[PDB]
Structures are given as structure tokens and as C-alpha cells.
Structure 1
Amino acid sequence: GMPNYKLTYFNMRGRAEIIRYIFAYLDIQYEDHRIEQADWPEIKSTLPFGKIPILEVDGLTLHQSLAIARYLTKNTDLAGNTEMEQCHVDAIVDTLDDFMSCFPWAEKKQDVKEQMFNELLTYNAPHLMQDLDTYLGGREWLIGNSVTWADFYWEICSTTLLVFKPDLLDNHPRLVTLRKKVQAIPAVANWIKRRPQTKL
């Protein structure tokens, strides 16, 4: 029968949201298990690699958000059309994920965290937006002629960045249009309405 899916993460969009977008789009039912940060140290010790999100599939546990996303979209319409275009999908996702992963989300010294966040957003982020804007050009989606999970991840990552830097895309209307098109996808739009409201 249908596989039993259980996703575990904090009560945030964060690194789990790409998986949630994919489930919503593929109309796959799953348990959206959200754990509190105070109970994190105890469940961390029980995970093979001690990091989240994880996805349990019928008694087997998977990890790494992008590895999971690729697994769920393989042979679906969210994956690249050609094998070459699947490379471009992976490459755009990793380009976005490289940048998001540079932010010191877990830094314990608040002043150090603020300094790096501001540096990344004031200098690195505008250059990346310009590279993405040129890459997209006048095309409808980032890769190919139909939406892929790279388009999802662009909307998810740009939403995070816009929390810390609201003027990020003032000069990139085509990147904004792409965000709005992802958000307008019926399954995605429905998830955005009923998902728990969190800062990040």
C-alpha cells in the first residue's frame, strides 16, 4: 500500500520546508512532526548523524534535506526533464544551499552571529541575486520549460532572506515574478495558507 511518511524537524520552515512543499505538490499525506528546541538535545543523541530534518519511510530513517527532496521527486514532474537538466536542478539547489549554509544559524555568540549575517546580506547576497537574475533571464522557470523543485527552493530560500533583508529583490522583478508563480501553484498556495506561521 501507500508508504507511511513521518518528517521530523523544529517548528520552522527552515531546511524542512522544501520537503513539505514537495509532499504538498505531490499530494502525499505525511506526519509533520515538530519538536521543541528544549527537547532537541535528547532526541539528537538517537539519530545516526545527530541532525534534522529526518524522514522515516516505513521503519527506515532518511536524512539530509536535499537528498530526501531528490529522492521524493525522482521520476516525478518536479525533477529535471532530461538528465542534463537534472544536473542543472541539482546545481542550482546546491548554489542556493551553499549560500544559506554560510549563515551561522547556530552561533552561540549573538554579536558574532549578527555581524556575519549583516556581512552576508550586505555584500554576498546582492551579487548572488544578480547571478540568479541573469541565469533566469526571460525564461519562465529556472530550468527547462516547467516548474522543478529548484524553483521551489528559490522561493523558500528567498523567503528566508527577505525576512532579514526586505529590499533584497527591489531591483530583480523577474526573480519576484518567479517567486509569485511558485506561490500561486494551487497545491503550494494551499500549503502556504494552512502551514503554521513561524518567523523562519
Structure 2
Amino acid sequence: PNVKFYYFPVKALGESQRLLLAYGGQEFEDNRISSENWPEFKPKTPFGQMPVLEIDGKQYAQSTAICRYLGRKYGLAGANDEEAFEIDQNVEFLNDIRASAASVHYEKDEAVKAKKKAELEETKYPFFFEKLNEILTKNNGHIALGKLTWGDFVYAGMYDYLKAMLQKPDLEQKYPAFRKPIEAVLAIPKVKAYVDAAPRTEL
């Protein structure tokens, strides 16, 4: 198929799709649209956002939905409904962590941001980190099924962005399991080759 991927020049929510395309051996145009050029493309997208994946002229939007689609195409979505459910479930948990951290990161009033951060540090984050540690340990370094799944790609693509929003650059010092899905994805030669060749960003 003729495949084009459109996202900002950052990893954040789109990198997981890039990593999955690499995994599946799919050649693609990796179109990294700057903030300055984005307004020209915005009204051409399904929801006025990126990422957008284009396959043979047809557009696919919504990062998690795209990852699940690619996951199924590439054999990373389990063998049956129950296995597929578990990946969905655990990725939805990751999304709760991300949404919580984003509520702090994108707060423009610094006094409000400080209050929110402190609240999450006492009432959500300790629970999230222990739960993530449980999941990664139960699954032998993976997000789900004890083995490589599309959930690991979601995790690996957003991990640096999530750490930035949490303001815990050193998270994996206390929780060494947290680097394991990233190592799993990078151990795949096609994926490592794409990462080596790809533009670097902090988030």
C-alpha cells in the first residue's frame, strides 16, 4: 500500500504509529508537519488534529485507534477476543496516567499548576506507579499478555513525553521495570533501524 503518516515533529502521541509501521516492514512517508505549516493541513484532516495515517488515499485518525488497527494487521493484538481485550484494557490505564499528567503539564497558571501537581503527587501518582509496576512485572516487561503487543508500542512511543509531563525524568531509577517495554520494542531490528534513522526530539 501507499502509506503516509502526518504528525508534528515530536514523538508524543504519534511515535507509536511510526514504530508499528516500522515493525510491520511498511515503507511510509514520515511527514513531520511543523506548527507553522500545520494550519494549511488542519482542515484536510478528519477531526482537525494529527496524527493522521493515510493508506491508499484513505485517512485514519485517532492515535489509539490507529495503533490498534496496525496491531491487528501485524499480529500484535492477541489471538482471540480475550487477549485483545487485555491489551485494550491496559492501554486505557496508560491513558489515565497520561491524561492526569497532562492536566498538570498544560496548566498555564503556575500557582494552579503547583496545586494540581501536589494533589496528584499525594492522591493519584503513587497508585499509578505501583499499578504500572505490577503490570510490567506480571507481564515480564510488557504492557499485556506477557509478550510483545501493540500496547508496548503505545508505551514506548510516549514514554519520554509522559516523563516530561510527570516531571520525573528519573522515574525508572525507582522503577527499573519501566524501561522494559522500550527495550522490547528496540530489540526488534526493523524498529531499531527506523529509530536510528529518525529525527530525534526531547518529547
Taking structure 1 as the reference length, the TM-score comes to 0.84
- After the TM superposition, which residues 151-190 of structure 1 pair with which residues of structure 2 at under 5 Å, given as runs? 151-163=152-164, 164-190=167-193
Question: Greater CA deviation, 135-144 or 67-76?
Answer: 135-144
Relative to structure 1, the CA distance from residue 42 to residue 21 in structure 2 (aligned partners, 3 Å threshold; closer, same or farther) is same
Counterpart selection for 1:73 from 71, 90, 93: 71
Amino acid at match of 1:29: E
Q: Is the 8 A contact 2:104 2:113 kept in 1?
A: no
Per-residue CA distance 1:30-76 (angstroms, 9 max, x = gap): 11111110222332233231111111111211110111111112153
**How far 1:187 moved relative to its partner?**
2.1
Relative to structure 1, the CA distance from residue 59 to residue 87 in structure 2 (aligned partners, 3 Å threshold; closer, same or farther) is same
User: Aligned residue for 2:24?
Assistant: 26
**How far 1:21 moved relative to its partner?**
0.7
User: Aligned residue for 2:7?
Assistant: 9
Matched-pair identity in %: 32
User: Aligned residue for 1:86?
Assistant: 84
SS of the counterpart of 2:157? helix
Per-residue CA distance 1:7-39 (angstroms, 9 max, x = gap): 111111111111001011111001111111022
Per-residue CA distance 1:145-173 (angstroms, 9 max, x = gap): 43001122222333323343122122222
Matches of 2:171 and 2:119 in 1, distance apart?
12
Q: Is the 8 A contact 1:96 1:157 kept in 2?
A: no
Unaligned segments of structure 1, at least 5 residues: none
Relative to structure 1, the CA distance from residue 110 to residue 193 in structure 2 (aligned partners, 3 Å threshold; closer, same or farther) is farther
Q: Is the 8 A contact 2:14 2:157 kept in 1?
A: no
Relative to structure 1, the CA distance from residue 67 to residue 139 in structure 2 (aligned partners, 3 Å threshold; closer, same or farther) is closer
Per-residue CA distance 1:92-137 (angstroms, 9 max, x = gap): 1121123223405994836378547845874433421210111233
Question: Greater CA deviation, 70-79 or 50-59?
Answer: 70-79
Q: Is the 8 A contact 1:151 1:182 kept in 2?
A: yes
Unaligned segments of structure 2, at least 5 residues: none
- After the TM superposition, which residues 141-156 of structure 1 pair with which residues of structure 2 at under 5 Å, given as runs? 141-156=142-157
Instruction: Quote the RMSD (CA, aligned, Å).
Output: 2.6
**More RCO (CA 8 Å, sep 6+):** 2
Matches of 1:79 and 1:116 in 2, distance apart?
39
Q: Does 1:39 align with 2:40?
A: no
Taking structure 2 as the reference length, the TM-score comes to 0.83
Amino acid at match of 2:179: V
Which protein is richer in helix relative to its size? 2
Q: How many positions carry a matched residue from both structures?
A: 198
User: Aligned residue for 2:135?
Assistant: 135
Amino acid at match of 2:175: H
Relative to structure 1, the CA distance from residue 178 to residue 61 in structure 2 (aligned partners, 3 Å threshold; closer, same or farther) is closer
